[PDB]
């Protein structure tokens, strides 16, 4: 599929209660691999994957410096925006940013982006063309006009086309071993008797990575999702994931109902009956 290097940045003001809390989190193919956290004894960019320990002290010191500088820049943005929106200094507010490039198997840039959001709302975003800006409201037009006639489109494009892409390739070579990791789901079915004739068959799926999975319930090779119940794919907390689906079925007909598990880790989908 399409590989991605994305950086997730949050600055949260704490008026009275010290300086704003700042945090960057880096992702390679939607897997956390670096994280900078302002709140810490000694704030440093730290490896979150074991394979990022290959990188020497020159990498970490430079990334830390970048972060410390960004923190101070966002610390202003929070104050700047209070002005644009005629807001109160007492109030706590949140700036979020998603920076990143994604490249094909060929190693070529497919798409780059820089998205800002203030208090959950979309603020300003770098277009597909990496030249123009898109201001969500009137406050965002002030900083569009500013970044236009300051040459920020040129500077970001140089990072997104150049730096982001070159470094993604490096990170993919280093982490390939552990990024290609897939644990296929272990799956059982539990019987739950209901007051009336009806009973609840629950299809379990445990110990699988990554989270991307599909659970379905079939009767006469026909999928019933309308009268089905299933929970959002949740982390086990040991690096694996969990998800169950459950259907309510007439008592004694438990063998006509079949559960099917779809995961990239499985050589083919997995079929299940109440045993």
């Amino acid at each position: 599929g399409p590989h991605s290097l994305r950086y997730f940045v949050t600055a949260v003001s704490r008026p009275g209660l010290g300086e704003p809390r700042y945090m960057e989190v880096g992702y390679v193919d939607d897997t956390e691999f670096v994280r900078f956290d302002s709140d810490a004894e000694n704030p440093r960019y730290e490896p979150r994957a074991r394979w990022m320990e290959q990188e020497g002290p020159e990498y970490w010191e430079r990334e830390t410096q970048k972060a410390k500088g960004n923190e101070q820049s966002f610390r202003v943005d929070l104050r700047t925006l209070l002005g644009y929106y005629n807001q109160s200094k007492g109030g706590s507010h949140t700036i979020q940013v998603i920076s990143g490039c994604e490249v094909g198997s060929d190693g070529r840039l497919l798409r780059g982006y820089q998205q800002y959001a203030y208090d959950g709302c979309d603020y300003i975003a770098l277009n597909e063309d990496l030249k123009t800006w898109t201001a969500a409201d009137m406050a965002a037009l002030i900083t569009k006009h500013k970044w236009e006639q300051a040459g920020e489109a040129e500077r970001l494009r140089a990072y997104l086309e150049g730096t982001c892409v070159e470094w993604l390739r490096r990170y993919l070579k280093n982490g390939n071993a552990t990024l290609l990791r897939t644990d296929s789901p272990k799956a059982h079915v539990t019987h739950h008797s209901r007051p009336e004739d009806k009973v609840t068959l629950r299809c379990w799926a445990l110990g699988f990575y990554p989270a991307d999975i599909t659970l379905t319930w079939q009767l006469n090779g026909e999928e019933l999702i309308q009268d089905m119940e299933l929970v959002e794919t949740r982390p086990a907390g040991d690096g694996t994931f969990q998800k169950w689906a459950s259907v309510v079925v007439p008592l004694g007909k438990e063998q006509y109902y079949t559960c099917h598990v779809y995961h990239q880790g499985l050589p083919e989908p997995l079929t299940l009956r109440w045993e």
């Binding site: 950086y7 500088g69 960004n70 820049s73 982001c164 470094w167």
Partner: peptide, 10 residues
């Protein structure tokens, strides 16, 4: 390697 907000406030 992260984007450098090189003191370019909004």
């Amino acid at each position: 390697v992260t984007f450098e907000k090189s003191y370019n406030t909004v």
